[PDB]
Amino acid sequence: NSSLPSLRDVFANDFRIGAAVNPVTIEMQKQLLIDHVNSITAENHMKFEHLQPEEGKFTFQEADRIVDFACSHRMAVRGHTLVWHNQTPDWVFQDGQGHFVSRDVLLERMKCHISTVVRRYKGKIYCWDVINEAVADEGNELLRPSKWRQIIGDDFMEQAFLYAYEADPDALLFYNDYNECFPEKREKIFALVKSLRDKGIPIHGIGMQAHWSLTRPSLDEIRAAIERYASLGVVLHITELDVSMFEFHDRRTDLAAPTSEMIERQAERYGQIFALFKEYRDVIQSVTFWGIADDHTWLDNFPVHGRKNWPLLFDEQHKPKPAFWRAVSV
Amino acid sequence: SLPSLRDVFANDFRIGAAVNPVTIEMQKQLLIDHVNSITAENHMKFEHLQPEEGKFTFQEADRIVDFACSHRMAVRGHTLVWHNQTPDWVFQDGQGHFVSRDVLLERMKCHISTVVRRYKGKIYCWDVINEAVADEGNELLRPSKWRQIIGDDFMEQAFLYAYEADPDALLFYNDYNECFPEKREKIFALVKSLRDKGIPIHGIGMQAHWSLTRPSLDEIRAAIERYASLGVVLHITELDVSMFEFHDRRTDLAAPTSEMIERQAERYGQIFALFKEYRDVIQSVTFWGIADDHTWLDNFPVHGRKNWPLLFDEQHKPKPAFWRAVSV
């Protein structure tokens, strides 16, 4: 590593380079993070259930440790995430009686959470994934079902963005989602963000999660999605990048190591992706990987529990993989 | 489908490889995919072209030239007059005594004329004189039989014979350790002297048999500048980056270490950035091979010790060095 290029430095004129972390991986992967990144996202500890597990019980200790680490290494922080259909406790939607709460009560609870969390980190966190994954990932409807949407109505997203803007009007506010380059879902995401900007809602950016495979989305699909979203005038962040060794249909559990062909194709794929991101450096301002090295990745247990995946630029011993050298040489 | 080296550097310089007929077959697709210049590693040296007086054995050189010409590759001719790889007959009479100056010039002229005329129109440049400057000491030139018999104008004569045989060729002085300041100044003085005398010497060949740390980038830049100030063409003729420092004769390693691989990558990125910077004065960069399955450094200076000096590995895959070189 002594003579290795530093990712944040190679890309200094193009975009920030980020990693998702938690307090345990900050300790386990500390030197890689120090050597390579200039942005951090909490993998889990700024989600609703990890910040307000019971009403009026806020548990900021883990998030605080992550922000302290970033600020002491001059790293930016992306806040992830305020309003999502997952990892939100049931209390949020329920009354004492158990029944679903009203629209007005859920809006009050949404405003209080957003206000308390965003004001705590104002001046340290420069952007927030305000809405995560509201667009349908299947079928013909625009929006996924969720209790937020069921109880408030379809303007729940408008309200979330307005509450976050009031809490920190200097933050950049994002709509964040995955499968963002598949054309049908891209058109839904575009339509949604267009309609919010067309009402004056303070949505400043689109977060492209980029939970990609070796084959999907194609490079033409990524190009088309970057152009489509940039044409709205928003900022783009690539927010959760990883390149899975398995396609969505491949649910094998038996592989104890990637083949040479997988390792070589992943290297080619990461070179191709970074060349494209560099080509769109005027609209992409940050690329965050959902991790930093193959000793920790959510893809070990998703979408198949208990297997192993090798999705990042560094291996389990924190050494650069063939993908690293192609990524940094674009 | 990787970037092609000749394409990456199309606006900067040719990209070459040393070959022989066995490595053209073993590395054929890498050559076709990457280079636009070829040098014969061995088979255009005097002992491989005229092993006995009047016996010319062009078959292997012809095969290398045919390959190049069939793939739109230039050819650098290597080498006409050198103290190495020249048969004993050249300097001897029938009674085994050394021949006179005039007989050796006749032999030098006959060899150069026959060899250069055969490839005229196909080979665009020649390393006419190889490695004439000394290692150490204050003496400018190393002793050699060529120099002993003819006198110090042997180089002047070789260049005039080569020019006569093909006035359209670029004629080079080629040498190694070309960026060490003491040797650099001798090479400068020698070429300057020939040039000012009107000798048709057009180019300096910088062999660039380098290590991970020597010469320094500052040494390489000074040498490029010093030689370019002569007004000659510059070719990097025999580039390789040894995983061992020259005096390191260690034999214990079966594979490059991660540190070796990563330092070599940084080194090759530094060197190509510098070459690119000096694109105005450098017109070709040839490596002394193309992939680590064949390299003279596997047996020099330690016989049978493997080295890993080039941009592609033994399986013809790009190394970290490839990616940093093309990144510049």
Ligand code: NA
């Ligand atoms: Na940018």
Ligand code: NA
């Ligand atoms: Na040039």
